[PDB]
Amino acid sequence: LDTQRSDIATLLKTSLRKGDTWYLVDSRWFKQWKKYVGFDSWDKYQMGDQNVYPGPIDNSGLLKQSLKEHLIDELDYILLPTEGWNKLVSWYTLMEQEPIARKVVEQGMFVKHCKVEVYLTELKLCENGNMNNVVTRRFSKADTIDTIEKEIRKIFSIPDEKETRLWNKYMSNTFEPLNKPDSTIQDAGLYQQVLVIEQKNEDGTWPRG
């Protein structure tokens, strides 16, 4: 009984792995099982009482032998892995009614992962006009092209009213346009490299075209 509580507590915390089979347990049957095994430290008084005994597993509330629509996890059902379901099946049997087996599937996602940034990127900076003049600054990998350019303008004394564009300079007149403003220094492929800032001429033409 206390073993039963410890078993299902750890089995509910099983890691989801693609292709694994999990089982839907009606939250009505499960709420009774909890009280009966003293699962919650704030609800131990009915532990072992034949009144809170859940009986054989009953998922009739969840079925129409097709499953009902709009069911929510935790509110209407509980998910247990094979081991967990077989243990509840051993201990209580199932109502005279088939099991509710569903598979773990993967969904691709774009997320945000945090990390402590120990090392900042040291980049070389110059203006197209006077490239002999090189300034070195350290930048966070999470900084966007937009943010890096504003900073380079502060360094090279460029008024916010003058239009600009940034380049990544290579050997022998090779210049990569950095025209994806929301990309991070990391996603733009800038490693520990020479940047070139360019001002739009008064007439509205560009010194590089």
List, in order, residues 6 or more apart from 160 with CB less than 8 Å away: 153
Please, what is the minimum distance in Å from the beta carbon of residue 95 to its own copies? 20
Q: How many residues bind its own copies (CB under 8 A)?
A: 50
The verdict on 65 binding its own copies (CB under 8 A) reads no
- 135 and 125 Cβ atoms separated by less than 8 Å: yes
Distance CA 37, CA 105 (A): 32
Please, what is the minimum distance in Å from the beta carbon of residue 55 to its own copies? 19
Query: In this complex, which beta carbon is closest to its own copies, that of residue 93 or of residue 101?
Result: 101
The verdict on 176 binding its own copies (CB under 8 A) reads yes
Distance CA 209, CA 206 (A): 5
Please, what is the minimum distance in Å from the beta carbon of residue 114 to its own copies? 4
**Contacts within 8 Å (CB) and 24+ apart, 137-141:** 139/185, 140/185, 141/117, 141/184, 141/185, 141/186
Please, what is the minimum distance in Å from the beta carbon of residue 202 to its own copies? 26
Query: In this complex, which beta carbon is closest to its own copies, that of residue 45 or of residue 96?
Result: 45
List, in order, residues 6 or more apart from 46 with CB less than 8 Å away: 35, 36, 38, 52
The verdict on 67 binding its own copies (CB under 8 A) reads yes
Distance CA 86, CA 89 (A): 5
Q: Which of 2, 50, 64, 72 binds its own copies (CB under 8 A)?
A: 72
Query: In this complex, which beta carbon is closest to its own copies, that of residue 51 or of residue 157?
Result: 51
Please state whether beta strands 77-81 and 21-26 pair in parallel, antiparallel, or not at all (unpaired): antiparallel
- For residue 169, give both structure tokens: 């300079």
Please, what is the minimum distance in Å from the beta carbon of residue 75 to its own copies? 5
Residues that bind its own copies (CB under 8 A): 15-18, 22, 24, 40, 42-43, 67, 69-72, 74-75, 79, 102-119, 140-142, 170, 174-177, 182, 184, 186-187, 189, 191-192
